[PDB]
Amino acid sequence: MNIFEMLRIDEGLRLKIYKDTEGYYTIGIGHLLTKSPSLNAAKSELDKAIGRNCNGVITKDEAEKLFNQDVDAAVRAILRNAKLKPVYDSLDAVRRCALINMVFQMGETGVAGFTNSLRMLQQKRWDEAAVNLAKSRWYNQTPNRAKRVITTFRTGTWDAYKNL
Numbered sequence: 001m002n003i004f005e006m007l008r009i010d011e012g013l014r015l016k017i018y019k020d021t022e023g024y025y026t027i028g029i030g031h032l033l034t035k036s037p038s039l040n041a042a043k044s045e046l047d048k049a050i051g052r053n054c055n056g057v058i059t060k061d062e063a064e065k066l067f068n069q070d071v072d073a074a075v076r077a078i079l080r081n082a083k084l085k086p087v088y089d090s091l092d093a094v095r096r097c098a099l100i101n102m103v104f105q106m107g108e109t110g111v112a113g114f115t116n117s118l119r120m121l122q123q124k125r126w127d128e129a130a131v132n133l134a135k136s137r138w139y140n141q142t143p144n145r146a147k148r149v150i151t152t153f154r155t156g157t158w159d160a161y162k163n164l
Contacts (some may be wrong), residue, residue: 001158003097005072007104009164010145013063017042017056021142027056028063030104031070058077074100077108082110087122095121105145106138130154151164 011030017039020026023041025033025042033045039056046054050062058066078084078099088099099121102111112118114136120129130150133139151160 001157001161003100004067006097006101006158006161007067007071009161010101010105010148013060015058015060015063027058027066029067029070031032031063031066031114069070070104071100074104078103081108083115084108087118090122090124092156094158095153098149101149101152102138102162128153 006060008029013029014027014079017025017027017033020030020032024035025039027046028035033042033049036042036114043054043056045092046056046058050058084103088096091099099111116135117132120132130153133150133153134146148160152158
């Protein structure tokens with residue numbers, strides 16, 4: 001298993017503009033288009049992102065290209081962030097995937113806000129961190145996905161996904 005397969009399981013693949021769990025316009029593999037309520041604003045962002053008139057629909061290839069960009073950008077954000085980098089550097093390969101997943105879902109800023117959990121992960125207090133991570137809006141809003149990520153941090157294995 002790798003970051004791509006992990007995220008593909010968590011986000012799914014949709015080739016037509018759709019609304020995410022938060023009600024925002026998204027396409028492909030969890031590629032947020034706009035927080036704006038206008039489908040028109042979304043279609044515009046889409047065309048800007050792909051470089052063609054898509055009329056709200058894209059191909060598999062296009063979805064995969066956006067996905068490669070998003071994953072790369074998530075990693076780069078962690079490496080540039082003063083709060084995130086040190087944690088990332090301290091983690092093993094599997095756990096590194098769990099942090100990248102959070103950043104992809106919630107943005108750098110959002111993750112950097114989990115101060116206490118970050119400190120516990122850095123200290124390698126797995127059980128404590130899993131308990132702290134669960135006390136968040138994130139966990140309450142998307143519990144099945146949060147549990148998968150949390151189990152990943154907790155165990156350092158891909159068990160939560162070997163099911164799926």
